[PDB]
Every structure is written in structure tokens, then in C-alpha cells.
């Protein structure tokens, strides 16, 4: 099945039905998942870690994301739009993978 | 010259590169007896061309050290614990292998292993294990020229019985049958030299009448490569004799000449006497461990195999069928090793 | 296009003062001492075109550019993957020398170098780049011209309507 | 007469000429005057007229089994072109 | 004998790092 | 061939995966030469691997007739070869050896067959001979009948038109997006 | 097309292309002042087959190629100037490769044929160059098409041609066959 499926993105930091940018690594071996290509075990993947973390509520229409708590010990400062975000469909920090959502746009 | 492919199924897909150390050859080989004199050169030839060689060895890290250099990263796989009686280990060793070469043999008996075990039981069990797999495409067995079922010596008789068993289980196996192999690590010239120099008297069975066809190690290794590069060779036995046939007296004389020995130290220990001096010592060997003091030469089996003419049969396959010209073992690079010792201008 | 007016001035002046003695084609290749099979390889003398992502003209043959832009490149040969680590393995000695270091100001310079070493070469001229805007949008004024929909029809005027 | 027999004889006919040259003027006259009649006589025969600025005028006929005979047509009048084509047909008959 | 590259003989699922999928002929 | 149609006994497919099914009599011996496995390869008794346009230095002519040439961006895969070399090797094997033995010799043969092929990168003007051709084919154009078809494109789906596009996953996604 | 509109400097190249060249008129500057934004006001997908060109036209990576996403950097790629066989236009392209893999295809300037524009099929069909590839000669048997060497395939073709004679041999050329 996976041999003839179109590579797709789940949509956490992307959209539900988009193409996934893919290189040809693992195509001969027969591996078609991102984590399978570099991890050969059966342990929990870092993607499994990041999904387990829950979205965090913030006030405002923009949140400053430094990745870590200290600005100089993490990702570059990033400003994420909170417009059109809810718990089910949160905004994502591209560097860290943290998820955010706000109710301010609904005048709350 | 045009490089010829290794005639293995689906090799054309996997193979890529010029054919060197870093190139990819589609040959994965399990060479039993890799650390031995014959096995090391076969491993060198296969691994030199970018192929992967699995070398099962009885635990000895210093003995298998040269095999580490033979190939690039991950090409020479050294398996630590090899036992001829362990089936599961043999299956694991040949798991990924598409060619298997068996160079496992004993020159002398001990208490742990006899001729019948190593030369008969191991070939049959390994033959069954290779046959059940199906992935293995080529099988090569190395045997002596003089091996025959109707042979006085037990070694050369058990070897022929094991070869027949292999031919029965695998019909497409090739039986390589070289003569006395000359090399830097050989047991032919080295034993003759040690006999001439560090032994009180050099006993020669009869007068050296027995004829032999010694061959150089590089020639046998190239013959192995030519066997693997042709599928038409399968199912055939090749008698890899040397270019020149020599009696043992000529070889002893020429060693004495090259070494510039003062005179002839060889004595006439005729047959029917070695058969009485060494006959109890064989039973001595079968109940004691391996001892450097006495071995190989000082056995009735050696005397029995030195009273016959170990020469290729007239109608037979040989180096010409493989398009190889064997190099003379009495001149050139082959004879350099004994030459370095003394040439009369040396020391 | 005017002048660099820097070290390149002395570079060009050293170029014009000095000259090289003529030798038969291919003779220098024997003096080089490299394997003679190197000269069996074929040569392409070309100038790289502009990358479509960027709008800079430095890499192109433009009067702005003062750097050598004509490369000698050799044909691509076999490449495979390392069985252990999947690295790209090669046996081509001349893989990156031409792209990296063989840069020439003029096509004749690269042709002279190839003929001096004995390499057979094919020169590919870059597709000419002319900075000519089309007649529809020749200038900023043309954006708001009457060409868009014609002269405004005045049949809607109340006087013309009545 | 002989114009009917090109199909039976030739598998293909090639007319190479230069687009604008003094040497190929006769070839151009030949192609712009007799190509229609030759095609009318031999409908299914491929008569290929191929041209380039630096091209050298020639008349090539391919016979059965890939045998090709090339005849140079440079600086020859349109009538001479026709005679040379007739000679090509006769040569094809000889085979 | 714990860590080896994924292209090693020891690796359970040995990797041939081929970047192209090969056509499989239809059966029979 | 046109005068007396003959049921083909051996069909050579030079990268043709879009052939009409009636083209092969279904008892013919089919040799497929190409670089993707598709309808052509499925119906082949012998498949000969060939390089793609990214893997070979080859000549193509435009709709305007301008001759342009490809370069070898990436090396050939597996036990595949350049297509003209495959055909010349087969010619030697079958007993009709072809004169050329190198790529420049092939280019010279192309120049002999058509002089414009020597002028790579330049479009050559065509003499206006179209009227004389139609005067030549007077009887044939009369032979041609009328069909109950309307002038329209033959491209059903733009994203998939050749074997490379059909293999492409991205083109399949584009087609799915358009067809929803 | 992948979008990161946060990186968008408000040039109007994408809008001007979509209007003047592509002619689908889908993109516009919606908004006033600093919060002005570029894109379709509704949720719409860019329909032109020239859609890929906005990615090259975008100076600051706000519009990017989704198939070629996070796969390589520019300095890693070797570019070879070749032509596109997707159609008979013969668009001049630059194929960027890392090792043995083609990573992306972008146009080149040729005012004669393709000013600097490339169609989406030509731009994104490199994906199908990694799939369903033929690597080895295949000769048919009772078990189907099976691996064979070049000599064996040529022998089978020789045995087949021996039977056929004259017009029984037939050749069909494909869309991507070259002149040689
Ligand atoms: N003069 C020659 O060299 C000739 C050799 N041959 C034949 O070639 C074969 C080997 O040649 P050669 O290499 O010279 O012999 P060697 O004894 O030099 O090589 C023997 C190999 O077999 C291994 N071996 C022996 N017994 C056992 C065992 N019971 N279990 C596991 N491994 C074992 C040894 O490993 P370890 O070192 O741990 O014992 C060694 O690696 C022999 O059968 C010989 O008859 C053929 C013609 C002439
Ligand atoms: S071309 Fe790029 S930067 Fe310019 S408006 Fe469009 S998306 Fe923004
Ligand atoms: Zn962050």
C-alpha cells in the first residue's frame, strides 16, 4: 500500500491534504516514513514526544516564541499569528514544535 | 583487457564501480578456513574486488589480524566462535552469502578432531545446510590432487569421501584440486627448509622417486576467481597442477642448491621402515594435543602419500581450461622466499 | 564596464606586458606528467546561465561582472553509493577540478588552454540576454494607458444620452 | 516512363540543398519545378527535401537492404539534376 | 559489539542505500 | 509497408508506452527498449534498459525545428546503457554491423541525413514547398474521406502524458486536486 | 506551492505574474497598511499550469516549492544545463543534482523559446524519475520476465529476428526517443 500511496502530511504544522517534501532516501530499501528512514528500533520517536505535549493558551493575537525559557538558550525569537486558532487546530512554532492557541480574535 | 563479471544471478543490478577495493561487487562469500594458508589468499582475491567476505574462525584474534586489512569498511566480517559441529552457527554464517568456499582441513590428527570428522562429517553437514538454503549459488571445495578413495593415507581418502558427499548433495559444486602449493606461508617449502636446516637428518621417503606438480598460491587464487567468473565451471573438478612436473629428489636438490647448503643432508629412509617408526606415533598423536615438535612429516600417512605419484590425470581439467598460465615454482618471485635465506653471497 | 580601478588594473597590465611562447598543440600535456588517458576526456567550454531564483547579474556575462566566468568542465562519470554508509562514491579524478578552479575571462582563453593541453573541446555560447521590455509594458506610464480598454466611450454622457 | 519506376526502385530519396547559395541554385530550381511531378508519379515514395545554409547539395537514393548511393548535384542545371537522377535509377536497376 | 552502521552485515535489516525504486515485472 | 500491410512478427518499441493496442498483433515478439516500466514493458518478451533524458547526451528537435542537445546530469542506473549504443550492439549481434562506433560518428550520420542537425542551437528556415507537395498528392487527398469527429485536443490530462509523468507522485496529486 | 506569507516583502511580482502572464487573476493585495496580505481572499488553489513560476519569481521565499521542501540547500547542488522533453517546445532548463539524485529542475533564459518560464509538468516531473525504473535486461520465461544479462537478451532478440523477414519487423518510436 505505502509503495503506491502519495506521500502526505498529517497537518500539525502543515495542511491535512498537502504533498510532503520527500527526498529519494530509503526508496530502494523500501522505507516510506520519515522516522523509519533514520530510526531502526521500536522505541518512541521524537514526533511521538512532540504530539504528546498539549497546546498552551495565551492572551493576544501574537505570541513570542523563544523555544526555551531563556532567549539565548534556544530557538530564534519567533512571532506566531494566533488568528483562527483553537484547541483542535493550534498554531505551531516551526523551530520547536510547540502548539499555541488563543481566543482573543473572537472578542474574548 | 575487459573486466569479466562475476557470473552470479542478478549481479548486473548490484555491481557498480571499477572493480576495486571501494567498488561494489555482488558477491557475498562465506570462506570457511579463512585464517588458513589457502583461505587467506581466497579471501584477499574476493575482497580486493569490492566484495564482502564472511570469515568464520575459531577464536584467535592474532591469527585473523591480516584479514582485517583485506577489505574496506564492513567488507570483511569476522565471526568469533566457529565450531564444525554447530549447525545453527553455520546457518547464520551463510545467511547472506551467495557463494561458499570450504578450505577447512587438517594435516594431522589430534584427540579432539580426527580426519573422519573434519574431512567427512563437516562437508556433509555443511552441504545439507547450503542445499536447504537455496540462496547460495556457487560452491567451491578445495582438495588435494592425490585424494582418492583407494588411497593408503587416511587424510587423502577421507578428503575424497567428503568430496563425493558434497557432489551428491550439491551437484553443481566445483572441486578445486591444487597440487603442493608454494607460498610465503606454505607448508611445502617451509617444512622442507626446516627439515634441511634445523633437523639432525632429513629423511626422504624412498629416494624421492614420487612425482609432484607444485603450484604457486597466486595461481590457485586466480583459478578460484576464474571459477567464480564462469558459471560453466560448475559441477566440474579442476586439477590445478603446476607448469612443470618434478620428482621430490629434484626439489630437494634444488632447495639445497638455492640455499647453498654445504652438502646433501638428506638420507634414504625407505618405505616399510617409516611404516614401522611412525605407526605407533600416529596412535601417540590421536591421544595427545597439538605439539610443534612432531607433526605432518613424522607420520605414516605422509610416508604413504610420498610413495605414490601425485600428478594430474591425463584426461582432466586444469589451468588451460581457465585460461591461466601457471608460473614456475622453481624460479622468479615464487622462489624469492627461500632465496632470501642464503644464496652464497648472502651471509 | 568603466574600470575596476583596483588590483585588477595591475593584473590586466601584467597580462598585456607579458606573453607566452607558442608550442604545438598537446605538447604541454606530455610535460604536465599526468596520466595520458586524462586527455581522452571531452571538454565543454560554457558560461553558466543565471539562476532563476536570484536576479543578480554577477554570475552572468554582463558588463557589471569582472570575474572569470568561462568554465572547462568534463563529462560526468559513474557514481555509486557506499554499501556501509550510503555515501556517494566515485572513481573520477577530474570530477570537481574544472568546476571549482578552471575559470577564464574569455572563451578564446579556455580554448587556448584546452588546445595547449590537448583536450578536445566544444564551446557553447550562452543564450543572449537582452534587457528589452515588451511594447505593452514598455514603461510605467503604459500601465495606465488607454491601451487597457480603449479610449473611454462618451456615449454615457447625459448630453449624449439626452 | 522512368519517372514511374522510382517507387519500385528506390526505398527513399533524399535531396539535400543549401537554402541560399550559388552552388545550390540548380538544386533549388529542380526542387521547385520537378518535385511536384515526381511526387505525382510516385505518391507513396518518400522524397525528402532537407536544407541548411551551409549544406552541400547532393542527391541520395536508398535501395533495398540499406544500400545508399550519394550523387553530388552542385553547380548543375535542373536538367542535369534529372539526368543524374535517371542514372541513379539505372544503377538501382543494375542491383 | 553493540553499535554498527545500518549497512553492516550484522544489522538485522541491512540497508542497500539505493535511491531509486525498481519496476517489479508482472507475475507469469 | 503502406501498400501491403503485413502482420508484424517482431515489434521493436523504442520507448513507446502509448501505442494503440492494434499495433501489436498479440502474437508478435515484442522488444521494449526504455527507462520506465509501463504498458510497453508489460507487453515485452525482452526488456532492454535505457538511459533517460537526464542521463544521456541526446539530440531533440523543437516544433520550430531548432536542434537542441541534452547533457548527462546524473549517471545511468544499474545495467542500463545509452539507447543508440544498445541498438548498435544489437546490430553487431544480429549480423548487420552499423558503420558508426562513436557518438560524434552518429552525429555525423545525422548531419548527412539532415544537414540542420549539424547546426545545434540554430533554427534553419524552410523553403516554402507546401504547395508543390499538395499538387503532388492530388489523388490521395481525394482518396481521404470524411470523419464524424470534431477538431479537439487529444490531451485528456495534461499532468500525465508520458511514462515519466505517469510514474510521478506529484502529478498524481495534481490530477487528484483537479478532479474533485 | 508552499506559503510562508510572514516572510513576504510586499513586492507585487506574484500578483503581476498571475495577472499579466498566467492570466488566472487569483492573487491580489488584500488589506491596507502594514497588515496588508498577499493571496487569494477565499480558499482557492492556483489553477494555472504556469503556477510554478511564482516560486522562482518570489525573491524572499514566501512562495516555495512544496515537492522540493527541506530536501537540500542551494550550495549542495550541481547544475547541468539541458532541455525539457515534456513537450515539443524544448524548454531550456537547469537540472540540479546531489550525487546520483536529481533534486530540482528550474528554467534557463532563452528568449527564442522559453523566455524564462517553465510549465509545471516539466518542473515537477523529476519525481517520476525515481520510480518504476528499469535497471536490468529482462527476458520472458514461463515464470514471467526475469533477470538476464545483456548477452542473453541479445541472443533472444537474434533468435526472434531470425524468424521474421522484411516488413514482419516493425519499429514504434516513443515520445521521448532521441535522434541518435
Ligand atoms: N599444501 C597446501 O597448502 C595444500 C592444501 N590443500 C588443502 O586445502 C585445505 C587447506 O589448505 P591449508 O590452508 O594449507 O590448511 P591450513 O591448515 O593452513 O588451513 C586450515 C584451516 O582450517 C581451519 N580448521 C582446521 N580444522 C578445523 C576444525 N576442526 N574446526 C574449525 N576450523 C578448522 C584452521 O583454522 P585453525 O587455524 O583455528 O586450525 C585453518 O584456518 C586443506 O584441506 C588442504 O588439504 C590442497 C592442496 C595443497
Ligand atoms: S512574489 Fe513573494 S514576496 Fe512578492 S508578493 Fe508574492 S509572495 Fe510576497
Ligand atoms: Zn519557538
Give the distance, in angstroms, between the CA of residue C130 and the centroid of all CA atoms in the same chain: 15
Nearest in space to C79 (alpha carbons), one of C65, C97, C92: C92
Does any domain span residue B111?
A: yes
CB atoms within 10 A of CB G51: 22
Taking an 8 Å cut-off on Cβ atoms, the answer to whether C84 and B24 are in contact is no
Q: How far is the C-alpha of D86 from the C-alpha of D59, rounded, in Å?
A: 11
Collapsed DSSP state (helix, strand, coil) of residue D36:
helix
CB-based burial label for D57 (10 Å; 0-12, 13-18, 19+): buried
The set of cell numbers assigned to B43 is: 579471501
CB distance B259 to B241 below 8 Å: no
Does any domain span residue B261?
A: no
Taking an 8 Å cut-off on Cβ atoms, the answer to whether E22 and A28 are in contact is yes
Q: How far is the C-alpha of B159 from the C-alpha of B153, rounded, in Å?
A: 10
Residue C150, sorted as left (phi over 0), alpha (psi -120 to 50) or beta, turns out to be: left
Shortest distance, CA E8 to any CA of chain G (angstroms): 22
The set of cell numbers assigned to A13 is: 504544522
Q: How far is CA B163 from CA B105, B285, C153, G6, in A?
A: 12, 25, 106, 77
Does any domain span residue B6?
A: no
CB distance D32 to F132 below 8 Å: yes
Strands (DSSP E) contained in C9-120 are 43-46, 70-74, 79-81, 88-90, 103-104
Place of cell 543534482: G97
- The residue whose CA is least distant from atom 14 of ligand 1 is B37
CB distance F15 to G177 below 8 Å: yes
Contacts of D4 (CB under 8 A, 6+ apart): D41, D42
Does any domain span residue B282?
A: no
Handedness of CA F24, F28, F32, F38 (dihedral sign): positive
Taking an 8 Å cut-off on Cβ atoms, the answer to whether E14 and B96 are in contact is yes
CA angle A66, A69, A72 (to 5 degrees): 60
Give the single-character DSSP code of C143. Answer: G
Phi, psi for residue A25 in degrees, rounded to 5: -65, 135
Instruction: With an 8 Å CB cutoff and a minimum of 3 pairs, decide whether chains B and C touch.
Output: yes
Handedness of CA D26, D31, D33, D34 (dihedral sign): positive
Give the CA radius of gyration of chain F.
20
Which chain F residues have a beta carbon less than 8 Å from that of G132? 36-38, 163, 167
Determine contact: F74 vs chain A, CB below 8 A: no
Q: Which residues pair with B211 in a beta bridge?
A: B247
C-contacting residues of F 21-60, CB under 8 Å? Answer: 57
CB distance G135 to F78 below 8 Å: yes
Contacts of C97 (CB under 8 A, 6+ apart): none
The order of strands in the sheet holding G78-83 is G78-83, G92-98, G101-107
Does any domain span residue B329?
A: yes
CB-based burial label for B336 (10 Å; 0-12, 13-18, 19+): exposed
Give the single-character DSSP code of E22. Answer: B
G-contacting residues of B 4-23, CB under 8 Å? Answer: 5, 9-10, 12-13
CB-based burial label for F70 (10 Å; 0-12, 13-18, 19+): buried
Does any domain span residue B332?
A: yes
For residue B333, how far is its CA from the centre of ligand 1 (angstroms)? 24
Contacts of C34 (CB under 8 A, 6+ apart): none
Place of cell 545439507: B128
- In C, what residues contact F, Cβ < 8 A? 44, 75-79
Residue to substitute from B13, B17, B25, B26, interface F, most F β-carbons within 10 A:
B13
Domain carrying residue B162: 11-246+307-341
Collapsed DSSP state (helix, strand, coil) of residue B27:
coil
Collapsed DSSP state (helix, strand, coil) of residue C142:
helix
Does any domain span residue B278?
A: no
CB distance G142 to G120 below 8 Å: no
Q: How far is the C-alpha of A86 from the C-alpha of D5, rounded, in Å?
A: 86
Nearest in space to B97 (alpha carbons), one of B52, B142, B131, B48: B52
Handedness of CA D21, D22, D23, D28 (dihedral sign): positive
Collapsed DSSP state (helix, strand, coil) of residue F103:
helix
CATH number at residue B172: 3.40.50.720
Measure CB to CB from residue C85 to each of E7, E18, E19 and give the nearest one: E7
Instruction: Spell A23-32 as b/e; 16+ CB within 10 A means b.
Output: bbbbbbbebb
Chain C residue closest in CA terms to B72: C84
The set of cell numbers assigned to F98 is: 552499423
The set of cell numbers assigned to C9 is: 588594473
Place of cell 608454494: B182
CB-based burial label for B228 (10 Å; 0-12, 13-18, 19+): buried
The per-residue DSSP string of B241-270 comes to: --SS-EEHHHHHHHHHHHHT-SS--EEEE-
Q: How far is CA C30 from CA B5, C33, C35, C119, G158, in A?
A: 34, 6, 9, 12, 46
The set of cell numbers assigned to B130 is: 547450503
- In A, what residues contact G, Cβ < 8 A? 18-24, 27, 79, 81
CB distance F170 to A19 below 8 Å: yes
The number of distinct structural domains making up chain B is: 1
Determine contact: C99 vs chain G, CB below 8 A: yes
Give the single-character DSSP code of F161. Answer: S
CA angle B210, B214, B218 (to 5 degrees): 170
Does any domain span residue B289?
A: no
The set of cell numbers assigned to F133 is: 507537395
The per-residue DSSP string of chain G comes to: -EE-GGG-----HHHHIIIIII-----EEESSGGG-EEE-SSS-----TTTTHHHHH-TTSSEE-STTSSS--GGG-EEEEEE--SSTT--EEEEEEETTEEEEEEE---TTS-SS---HHHHHGGGGGSSSB--S-EEEETTEEEE--HHHHHHHHHHHHHH--GGGEEEEE-TT----
> Is the CB of G60 within 6 Å of ligand 2?
yes
Q: Which residues pair with A74 in a beta bridge?
A: none
Which residue blocks in B94-216 are alpha helix, DSSP H? 115-116, 122-133, 154-169, 189-198
Give the single-character DSSP code of A76. Answer: P
- Counting as contact any 3 or more CB pairs under 8 A, the partners of G are A, B, C, E, F
Q: How far apart are the first and last CA of chain F?
A: 46
Q: How far is the C-alpha of C45 from the C-alpha of C74, rounded, in Å?
A: 9
Which residue blocks in F32-145 are alpha helix, DSSP H? 39-42, 83-94, 103-113, 130-136, 138-143
Determine contact: G28 vs chain B, CB below 8 A: no
Give the single-character DSSP code of C141. Answer: G
CB distance G119 to G49 below 8 Å: yes
Closest ligand 2 atom number to CA of residue G11: 4
For residue B38, how far is its CA from the centre of ligand 1 (angstroms)? 7
> Is the CB of G64 within 6 Å of ligand 2?
no
Handedness of CA G50, G51, G56, G58 (dihedral sign): positive
Taking an 8 Å cut-off on Cβ atoms, the answer to whether G136 and B10 are in contact is yes
Q: How far is the C-alpha of G33 from the C-alpha of F109, rounded, in Å?
A: 65
Nearest in space to D10 (alpha carbons), one of D61, D68, D77: D61
Helix axes B189-198, B248-259, angle to 10 degrees: 60
CB distance D13 to D46 below 8 Å: yes
Handedness of CA B140, B142, B146, B152 (dihedral sign): negative
Give the single-character DSSP code of B323. Answer: T
CA angle C44, C49, C52 (to 5 degrees): 145
CB atoms within 10 A of CB C70: 22
Chain A residue closest in CA terms to E13: A40
CB distance G91 to G107 below 8 Å: yes
Nearest ligand for residue B141 CA: 1
Q: How far is CA D19 from CA B3, C136, D24, D26, D29, in A?
A: 50, 35, 8, 12, 11
Collapsed DSSP state (helix, strand, coil) of residue B340:
helix
Exp. method: cryo-EM
Measure CB to CB from residue A27 to each of E11, E12, E19 and give the nearest one: E19
For residue G62, how far is its CA from the centre of ligand 2 (angstroms)? 6
Give the single-character DSSP code of F36. Answer: B
Give the distance, in angstroms, between the CA of residue G108 and the centroid of all CA atoms in the same chain: 13
Q: How far is the C-alpha of C30 from the C-alpha of C23, rounded, in Å?
A: 12
Determine contact: C52 vs chain G, CB below 8 A: yes
Determine contact: C159 vs chain G, CB below 8 A: no
Residue C160, sorted as left (phi over 0), alpha (psi -120 to 50) or beta, turns out to be: alpha
Collapsed DSSP state (helix, strand, coil) of residue B7:
coil
Most distant CA atoms of chain C, gap in Å: 97
Q: How far is CA F39 from CA E2, F36, F53, G91, in A?
A: 48, 10, 20, 27
Amino acid at each position: 500500500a505505502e509503495k503506491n500511496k502519495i506521500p502526505e502530511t498529517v497537518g500539525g504544522a502543515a495542511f491535512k491534504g498537502d504533498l510532503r517534501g520527500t527526498s529519494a532516501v530509503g526508496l530502494g530499501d523500501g522505507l516510506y516514513s520519515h522516522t523509519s528512514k533514520w530510526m531502526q528500533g521500536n522505541g518512541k520517536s521524537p514526533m511521538d514526544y512532540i504530539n504528546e505535549v498539549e497546546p498552551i493558551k495565551v492572551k493576544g493575537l501574537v505570541v513570542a516564541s523563544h523555544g526555551s525559557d531563556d532567549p539565548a538558550l534556544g530557538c530564534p525569537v519567533e512571532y506566531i499569528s494566533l488568528k483562527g486558532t483553537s484547541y483542535e487546530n493550534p498554531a505551531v512554532c516551526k523551530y520547536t514544535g510547540n502548539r499555541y492557541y488563543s481566543d482573543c480574535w473572537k472578542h474574548g | 583487457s575487459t573486466l569479466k563479471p562475476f557470473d552470479l544471478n542478478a549481479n548486473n543490478a548490484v555491481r557498480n564501480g571499477p572493480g576495486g577495493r571501494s567498488s561494489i561487487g555482488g558477491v557475498v562469500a562465506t570462506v570457511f578456513g579463512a585464517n588458513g594458508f589457502i583461505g587467506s589468499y581466497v579471501v584477499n582475491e574476493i575482497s580486493k574486488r569490492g566484495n564482502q567476505v564472511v570469515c568464520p574462525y575459531r577464536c584467535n584474534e592474532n591469527k585473523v589480524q591480516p584479514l582485517k586489512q583485506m577489505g574496506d569498511l564492513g567488507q570483511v566480517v569476522l565471526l568469533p566462535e566457529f565450531d564444525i559441529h554447530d549447525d545453527e552457527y553455520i546457518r547464520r554464517a551463510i545467511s547472506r552469502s551467495n557463494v561458499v568456499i570450504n578450505c577447512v582441513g587438517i594435516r594431522q590428527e589430534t584427540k579432539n578432531y580426527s580426519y573422519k570428522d573434519v574431512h567427512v562429517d563437516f562437508p556433509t553437514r555443511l552441504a545439507k545446510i547450503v542445499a536447504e538454503s537455496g540462496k547460495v549459488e556457487r560452491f567451491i571445495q578445495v582438495s588435494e590432487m592425490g585424494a582418492d578413495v583407494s588411497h593408503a593415507s587416511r587424510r587423502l581418502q577421507t578428503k575424497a569421501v567428503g568430496d563425493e558427499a558434497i557432489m551428491k548433495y550439491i551437484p553443481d559444486a566445483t572441486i578445486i584440486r591444487p597440487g603442493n602449493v608454494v607460498g610465503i606461508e606454505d607448508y611445502f617449502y617451509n617444512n622442507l627448509i626446516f627439515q634441511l636446516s634445523y633437523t639432525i637428518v632429513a629423511p626422504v621417503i624412498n629416494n624421492g622417486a614420487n612425482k609432484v606438480q607444485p603450484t604457486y598460491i597466486l595461481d590457485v587464487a586466480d583459478a578460484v576467481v576464474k571459477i567464480l567468473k564462469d558459471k560453466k565451471t560448475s559441477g566440474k573438478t579442476y586439477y590445478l597442477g603446476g607448469p612443470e612436473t618434478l620428482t621430490m629428489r629434484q626439489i630437494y636438490d634444488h632447495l639445497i642448491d638455492t640455499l647453498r647448503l654445504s652438502n646433501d643432508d638428506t638420507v634414504n629412509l625407505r618405505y616399510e621402515l617409516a611404516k614401522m617408526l611412525y605407526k605407533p606415533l600416529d596412535t601417540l598423536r590421536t591421544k595427545l594435543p597439538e605439539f610443534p615438535f612432531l607433526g605432518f612429516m613424522m607420520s605414516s600417512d605422509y610416508a604413504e602419500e610420498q610413495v605414490a605419484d601425485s600428478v594430474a590425470p591425463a584426461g582432466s581439467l586444469g589451468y588451460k581450461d581457465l585460461s591461466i598460465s601457471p608460473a614456475k615454482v622453481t624460479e622468479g618471485l615464487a622462489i624469492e622466499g627461500v632465496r632470501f635465506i642464503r644464496v652464497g653471497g648472502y651471509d | 564596464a568603466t574600470a575596476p580601478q583596483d588590483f585588477s588594473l595591475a593584473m590586466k597590465k601584467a597580462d598585456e606586458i607579458y606573453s607566452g611562447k607558442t608550442v604545438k598543440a598537446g605538447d604541454i600535456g606530455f610535460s604536465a606528467g599526468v596520466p595520458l588517458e586524462t586527455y581522452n576526456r571531452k571538454v565543454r567550454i560554457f558560461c553558466p546561465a543565471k539562476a532563476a531564483s536570484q536576479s543578480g547579474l554577477g554570475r552572468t556575462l554582463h558588463p557589471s561582472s569582472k570575474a572569470p566566468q568561462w568554465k572547462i568542465v568534463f563529462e560526468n562519470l559513474s557514481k555509486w553509493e557506499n554499501p556501509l554508509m550510503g555515501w556517494t562514491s566515485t572513481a573520477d579524478p577530474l570530477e570537481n577540478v574544472g568546476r571549482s578552479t578552471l575559470l577564464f575571462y574569455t572563451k578564446e582563453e579556455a580554448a587556448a588552454f584546452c588546445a595547449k593541453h590537448g583536450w578536445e573541446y566544444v564551446v557553447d555560447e550562452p543564450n543572449p540576454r537582452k534587457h528589452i521590455r515588451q511594447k505593452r509594458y514598455l514603461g510605467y506610464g503604459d500601465n495606465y494607458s488607454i491601451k487597457r480598454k480603449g479610449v473611454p466611450d462618451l456615449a454615457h454622457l447625459p448630453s449624449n444620452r439626452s | 516512363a522512368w519517372k514511374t519506376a522510382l517507387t519500385t526502385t528506390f526505398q527513399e530519396l533524399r535531396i539535400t540543398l543549401s537554402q541560399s547559395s550559388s552552388s545550390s541554385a540548380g538544386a533549388r530550381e529542380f526542387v521547385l519545378g520537378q518535385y511536384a511531378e515526381l511526387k505525382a508519379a510516385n505518391p507513396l515514395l518518400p522524397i525528402l527535401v532537407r536544407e541548411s545554409n551551409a549544406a552541400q547539395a547532393s542527391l541520395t537514393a536508398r535501395y533495398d537492404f540499406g544500400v545508399e548511393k550519394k550523387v553530388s548535384i552542385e553547380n548543375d542545371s535542373a536538367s542535369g539534376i534529372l539526368s543524374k537522377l535517371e542514372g541513379l535509377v539505372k544503377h538501382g536497376q543494375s542491383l | 559489539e553493540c553499535y554498527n552502521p545500518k549497512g553492516s552485515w550484522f544489522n538485522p535489516a541491512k540497508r542497500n542505500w539505493k535511491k531509486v525504486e525498481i519496476w517489479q515485472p508482472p507475475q507469469v | 509497408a503502406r501498400t501491403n500491410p503485413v502482420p508484424a512478427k517482431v515489434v521493436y518499441l523504442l520507448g513507446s508506452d502509448d501505442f494503440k493496442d492494434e499495433e501489436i498483433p498479440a502474437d508478435a515478439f515484442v522488444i521494449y527498449q526504455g527507462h520506465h516500466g509501463d504498458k510497453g514493458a508489460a507487453r515485452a518478451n525482452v526488456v532492454l534498459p535505457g538511459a533517460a533524458y537526464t542521463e544521456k547526451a541526446s539530440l531533440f528537435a523543437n516544433t520550430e525545428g531548432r536542434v537542441q542537445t541534452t547533457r548527462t546530469a546524473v549517471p545511468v542506473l544499474g545495467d542500463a546503457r545509452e539507447d543508440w549504443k544498445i541498438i548498435r550492439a544489437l546490430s553487431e549481434v544480429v549480423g548487420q554491423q552499423l558503420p558508426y562506433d562513436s557518438q560524434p560518428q552518429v552525429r555525423a550520420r545525422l548531419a548527412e541525413v539532415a544537414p540542420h542537425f549539424a547546426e545545434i542551437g540554430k533554427a534553419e528556415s524552410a523553403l516554402w514547398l507546401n504547395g508543390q507537395y499538395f499538387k503532388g498528392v492530388k489523388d490521395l487527398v481525394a482518396k481521404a474521406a470524411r470523419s464524424t469527429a470534431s477538431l479537439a485536443t487529444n490531451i485528456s490530462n495534461y499532468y500525465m502524458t508520458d511514462a515519466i509523468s505517469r510514474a510521478s507522485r506529484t502529478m498524481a496529486k495534481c490530477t487528484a486536486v483537479r478532479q474533485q | 506551492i508552499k506559503t510562508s506569507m510572514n516572510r513576504c516583502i510586499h513586492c507585487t511580482r506574484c500578483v503581476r505574474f498571475t495577472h499579466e502572464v498566467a492570466g488566472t487573476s487569483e492573487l491580489g493585495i488584500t488589506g491596507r497598511g502594514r497588515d496588508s496580505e498577499v493571496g487569494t481572499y477565499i480558499e482557492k488553489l492556483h489553477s494555472s499550469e504556469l503556477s510554478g513560476n511564482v516560486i522562482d519569481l518570489c525573491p524572499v521565499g514566501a512562495l516555495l516549492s512544496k515537492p522540493y521542501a527541506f530536501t537540500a540547500r542551494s550550495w549542495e547542488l550541481k547544475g547541468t544545463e539541458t532541455i525539457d522533453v515534456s513537450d515539443a517546445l524544448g524548454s531550456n532548463i537547469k537540472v540540479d543534482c546531489r550525487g546520483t539524485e536529481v533534486m530540482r529542475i528550474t528554467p534557463r533564459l532563452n528568449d527564442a523559446i522559453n523566455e524564462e518560464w517553465l510549465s509545471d509538468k516539466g518542473r515537477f516531473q523529476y519525481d517520476g524519475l525515481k520510480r518504476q525504473r528499469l535497471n536490468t535486461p529482462l527476458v520472458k520465461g514461463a515464470k514471467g520476465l526475469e533477470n538476464a544479462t545483456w548477452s542473453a537478451a541479445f541472443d533472444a532478440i537474434r533468435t526472434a529476428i531470425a524468424g521474421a523477414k522484411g516488413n514482419e519487423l516493425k519499429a514504434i518510436a516513443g515520445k521521448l526517443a532521441d535522434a541518435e
